[PDB]
Design a protein around this nucleic acid. Sequence first.
RNA 1: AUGACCCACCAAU
RNA 2: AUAAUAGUAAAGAUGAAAUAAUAAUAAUAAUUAUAAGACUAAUAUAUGUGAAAAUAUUAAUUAAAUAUUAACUGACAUUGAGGGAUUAAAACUAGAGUAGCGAAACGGAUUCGAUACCCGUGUAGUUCUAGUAGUAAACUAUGAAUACAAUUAUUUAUAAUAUAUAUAUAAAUAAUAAAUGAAAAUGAAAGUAUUCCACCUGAAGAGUACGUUAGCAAUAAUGAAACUCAAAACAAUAGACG
Lengths: 198, 58, 91, 45, 101, 131, 236, 34
Amino acid sequence: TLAELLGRSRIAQVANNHKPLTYTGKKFHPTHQIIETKPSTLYRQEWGLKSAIPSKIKSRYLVYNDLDTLERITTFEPRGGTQWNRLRFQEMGVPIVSNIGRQNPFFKKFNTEIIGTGGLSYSLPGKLKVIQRTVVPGRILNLAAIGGFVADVVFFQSPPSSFNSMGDFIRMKTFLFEILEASMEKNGSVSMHARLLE
Amino acid sequence: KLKRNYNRSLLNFQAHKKKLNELLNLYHVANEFIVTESQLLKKIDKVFNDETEEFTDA
Amino acid sequence: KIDQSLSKKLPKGTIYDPFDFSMGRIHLDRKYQDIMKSGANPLEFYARPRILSRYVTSTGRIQHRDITGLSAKNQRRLSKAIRRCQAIGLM
Amino acid sequence: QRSLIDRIQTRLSELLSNDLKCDQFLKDHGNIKKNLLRKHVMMDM
Amino acid sequence: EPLVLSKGYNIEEVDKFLAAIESAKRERAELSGLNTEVVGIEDIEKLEDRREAILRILSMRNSENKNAIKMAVELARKEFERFPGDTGSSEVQAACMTVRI
Amino acid sequence: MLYELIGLVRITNSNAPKLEAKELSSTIGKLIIQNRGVVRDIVPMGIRYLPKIMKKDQEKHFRAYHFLMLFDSSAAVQSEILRTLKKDPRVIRSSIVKVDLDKQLDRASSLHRSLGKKSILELVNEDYQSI
Amino acid sequence: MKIQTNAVNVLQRTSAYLKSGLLKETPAWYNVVASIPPSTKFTREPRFKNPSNGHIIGKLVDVTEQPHANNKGLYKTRPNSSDKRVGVKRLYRPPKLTYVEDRLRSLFYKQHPWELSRPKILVENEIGDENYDWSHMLQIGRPLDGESVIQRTMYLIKTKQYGDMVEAYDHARYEFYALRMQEETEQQVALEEAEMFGSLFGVSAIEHGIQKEQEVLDVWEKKVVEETELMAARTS
Amino acid sequence: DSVMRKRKKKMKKHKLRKRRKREKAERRKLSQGR
RNA sequence: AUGACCCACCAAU
RNA sequence: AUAAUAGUAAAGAUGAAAUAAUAAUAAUAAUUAUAAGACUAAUAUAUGUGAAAAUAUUAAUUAAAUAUUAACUGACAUUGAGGGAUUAAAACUAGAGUAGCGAAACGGAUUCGAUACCCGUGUAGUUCUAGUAGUAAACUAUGAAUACAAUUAUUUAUAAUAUAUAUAUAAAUAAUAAAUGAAAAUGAAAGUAUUCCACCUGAAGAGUACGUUAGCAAUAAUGAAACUCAAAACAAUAGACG
């Protein structure tokens, strides 16, 4: 049926969300679903949205909130790229305690609160990749953004010269960190610890 | 006609019972005091004599 | 050492991006930068001159619904409470 | 009073399903004959 | 008249409803494992006033003319009605407009 | 009906700050009572320097002892209370505002109503706990 | 614009010219638009039932069709305001295509925001050849997504393998987790194994994460070279 | 036309001046015992 | 073509 | 305005200047302090509320005004000649008041002249109280009522939902479709229709004269004719002009 067809439509497979496309608010979990397009459609300038995406866009990944709007345009930001952060979590290979997983590994009528890893992890907590993890390089904020995830830098002794070496480019400089671990506060926020090798 | 009468009856009924409930919800218990010369002395003399409530907060 | 207006300091909690680490981003943010607002009869605070002291240009002046942005009813009752508080000794 | 509506309505209404059981009923007492249902049904109570 | 009140509060119902409390208070204690002491009179003095205030706080002499009218329209409707309830009869409507007039 | 009097009384006793305030609180009260009407809740608001120097009887009171009395009386008694107040040299800046109880049989003092509360019977079980 | 006439009336128009002399040879197309006459009615035809929620559009609850005093303990007998407010525009008004599955979609994506972050094939391929046995939360062609979980809960509520919608979805929610859990291990295995079997990698997720980031730093560093300094002269 | 309406203004003002002159004749010997 | 005439300027938000 | 105070020579106003009871009587400015009046910032959109006048400093009393159900009434209405009621600003008659404002007045400017614009005093009045009067571009230049007609966005009222959501209703406001229209444009009316009342029939003369009623009065309503023209009016367009 017309509806049956729409009830399975990829357009509807994507849920609605009017969360701002700027969200200046501190961000922990993603706001919208990125729409992936095969390079073919990109040259064909086809993205499956109500209106074709402008050739100015050269990405294959975009995020949309309004198929189309009064302004006679589709409200989309071609900067949908979470595909990188989450993958880097896999590049980082570290599991989350996830409080206590009674019965079900994530445990929990509706699991709105304590949703779980939040699709940030679907691997057995313990594994041997741990072999001291894989000292993943991170960008020290002062805290160190490792694979798009800030982790508080820890060290045997405070090395001021290391910070002085990068001067004000501490974030610009990237140092390998043996991630101690990460955790998902019920607000879906990951808190982790770094190992400044200095 | 019968259902109409019931509709009018239950309405009047609901209002009066609430009236009664609220009347024995406070008039039954409202300080059980202010209304007499003696009591006023008690409350007023049990106000600034020990506690005082102002904003300013915490 | 460096000036503030040139260095985002995303908290660790968030998700930093390659662009996110840019000046463009800083400018971007700037561009896109309340129990009364919650829904409590703002007039009931006809006295408590403390609560009303808030939505006030600090010059005995209430604010146009461009700042306060409280509900028409909430703002008008808040304004009435302020005016009533002027009558009620305190403020 | 509300009780009346119960049984009163309940059987005339119940008669919805009984164009056969009413047969038992129609007799005891004795279209607008459907209206004849409420007729004597009402009297019972 | 003296002792009149608002929202259907006839003084009697008050006397009888207020009274309910008397029965309840004492009977609440008859059972359980707590004995009877000061409740011999439950401050006749205190209960006497409690009701009293209720009366001042529900006395038309201390309410609003609107409320006295709310009582009146009724009185009239009930003196001019065609049957218990009718409130649309021309005389009922007339009588009602009369009180206000 | 239920009225309220957020009046600001003056003070002169370097010592007792709530001298006059309490003495007036008695006055008003004595009269709210001898006249068919129920006093309800009194909520001493203590002292708060007045935002401006409120000159009363050429005394330029820079501060006053705010206080509140929730009362109930006929218009007249309520009106009359106004007269008493302004005309009481002690009080400095009075005020009686109404508290219609058409919906809630018992209304609390404005303050608690902004504290989240709403009724004395409520505000009483609010403390009832104990026994 | 306004329902025009000189648009779907060309044959009528040409015919006249063709019968008089303004034209000598008929416009070739003449026959085609005769064989296939143009739909001329432009009526705002009415609707009677919602194509989706199966609701009906066109009924009134005559009071007799009711007898239970409303929850508001009250036997209503006289028709109510809205119940007499001629609602004809409603029939023409297109109804909303409400779907409980859409709520489940949002619910799952809210509980699993990373699923939204996960690339989805919104581009629909020949939807015709898509008959999918959904007793399993996996299908050939269709990839893994929260949408699969939704189409899955349907069996558990249609076939009724489980009970209500909430319980049904969860049964598949754990079904999904497993597929995702196994995939996570599979993902690492490729590398670990390939990593321990003659494999060289030009750039990894950490590498794009650093190169692009360091690239950005090029701009910021140069930028503050003007901003901070310009202020010294702007204030000295 | 506003200009046409303004002309009324000039005419009413002119008549007002005449009225002032007529006012002298009014309340005089003509409107009393005659 | 009709067709001898045209007359006013004062200084700021 | 008025003393108190200390302070010194200008003040103040304007395009620029003059003056006045400005200031060597010590001013203005300052800071205190008395008194007298009018008014009511923000909020504040006149959103709204009122029949229209009108109307946002606070409270008190009184009164009207909401939606939705429910009970009733049982066409009881649509609105209306005449009548009645209310009716801005000015004006008026009494009584109090009178700070500021400001007709009149008088003075100083400017100007060719300036009984103006500008500036200084500043009286009737603007305030209240009781009146009187009954007119305004009293204009949305749009009489009231009912049934109906295509969309969108915002207010927003309000029910509902499994409040915080996305929905159903109304209400208003803003863009329009159609339709109407001399066009400008009107847009749920200036559309489609029905009902009732008011009013118009070229321009001048004229809302004049006269008569009559009403008013303390100014005036208000009512409201002709002769004489004289082929004129007179409105929306759209070019163009010249500022």
